[PDB]
Design a protein around this ligand. Structure first.
Ligand SMILES: OC[C@H]1O[C@@H](O[C@H]2[C@H](O)[C@@H](O)[C@H](O[C@H]3[C@H](O)[C@@H](O)[C@H](O)O[C@@H]3CO)O[C@@H]2CO)[C@H](O)[C@@H](O)[C@@H]1O
Ligand SMILES: *[C@@H]1O[C@H](CO)[C@@H](O)[C@H](O)[C@H]1NC(C)=O
Ligand SMILES: [Cl-]
Ligand SMILES: [Cl-]
Ligand SMILES: [Cl-]
Ligand SMILES: [Cl-]
Ligand SMILES: [Cl-]
Ligand SMILES: [Cl-]
Ligand SMILES: [Cu+2]
Length: 235
């Protein structure tokens, strides 16, 4: 159970975005139904009044939290991967529009899942804004918590993989459109019961064995990381 508080751009806090430039749901409950429209941008998908201005090559940092800003972020039990996708705003997230910019699952060196390092990063993880067409976009940040992913929600609705999905409204201003956005995947639709990484037992399978759900990261993606860029406690 975790939500996005806001974003930073090039290490500068853009301020509380909840229901402002983040299409925030009313609480931190997970989405579990892979076929539901809630898979797109969570349970309250509507246009919010602001869109964060960025340029290609900028660092866009999502900041997550549990109950209050810069708290425990997400429960430590929620081991799992993190992804970020992009789609044009005009889609409203519908169709085959979502392009993957970032994926982190398990890091063998450090023996840590993406979620583990998200906590250590005070909720912060980033992508570099790609050289796509200037305009309005949705950035869909997705945490998958696997602590009940031994089961399938479709089979047992009290268990299953848990999705913490947040959509940020981002306006790309300066960009040469040298890497125009390719075809994407639909949400709901891309993840099914047979998809690698949706049904997995973290308690008996080695994490080195884990395969995150496709699609793969777009070759035009410019970078990303799970790491603190800024100190909220000084805000
Ligand atoms: O169900 C057993 C599993 O519980 C996990 O903890 C979650 C609780 O089940 C869940 O009810 C609680 O929801 C809280 C939420 O954290 C809080 O922010 C909000 O204000 O109130 C909700 C209650 O309405 O969330 C926790 C995770 O934070 C354990 O993590 C898991 O190991 C255990 O198996
Ligand atoms: C999952 O979502 C589908 C598509 O909206 C819906 O028809 C179905 O009833 C949902 N499942 C549950 C258990 O609510
Ligand atoms: Cl839970
Ligand atoms: Cl659900
Ligand atoms: Cl860090
Ligand atoms: Cl550019
Ligand atoms: Cl579907
Ligand atoms: Cl980065
Ligand atoms: Cu939770």
């Amino acid at each position: 159970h975790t939500l996005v508080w806001g974003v930073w751009v090039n290490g500068v806090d853009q301020g509380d975005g909840r229901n402002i430039y983040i299409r925030s749901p009313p609480n931190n409950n997970p989405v579990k139904n892979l076929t539901s429209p809630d898979m797109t941008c969570n349970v309250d998908n509507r246009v919010v009044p602001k869109s964060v201005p960025v340029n290609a090559g900028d660092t866009l940092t999502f900041e997550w939290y549990h109950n209050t800003r810069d708290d425990d972020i997400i429960a430590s039990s929620h081991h799992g991967p993190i992804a970020v996708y992009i789609a044009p705003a005009a889609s409203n997230g519908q169709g085959n529009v979502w392009v993957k910019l970032f994926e982190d699952a398990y890091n063998v060196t450090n023996s840590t899942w993406a979620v583990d390092r998200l906590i250590t990063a005070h909720g912060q993880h980033s992508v570099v804004v790609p050289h796509v067409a200037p305009g309005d976009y949705l950035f869909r940040a997705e945490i998958i918590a696997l602590h009940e992913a031994d089961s399938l929600y479709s089979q047992n609705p009290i268990r299953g993989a848990q999705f913490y999905i947040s959509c940020a409204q981002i306006t790309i201003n300066s960009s040469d459109d040298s890497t125009p956005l390719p075809a994407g995947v639909p949400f709901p639709g891309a993840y099914t019961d047979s998809t690698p990484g949706i049904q997995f037992n973290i308690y008996t399978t080695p994490a080195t064995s884990y395969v995150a759900p496709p699609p793969s990261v777009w070759s035009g993606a410019l970078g990303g990381s799970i790491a603190q860029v800024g100190d909220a406690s000084l805000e």
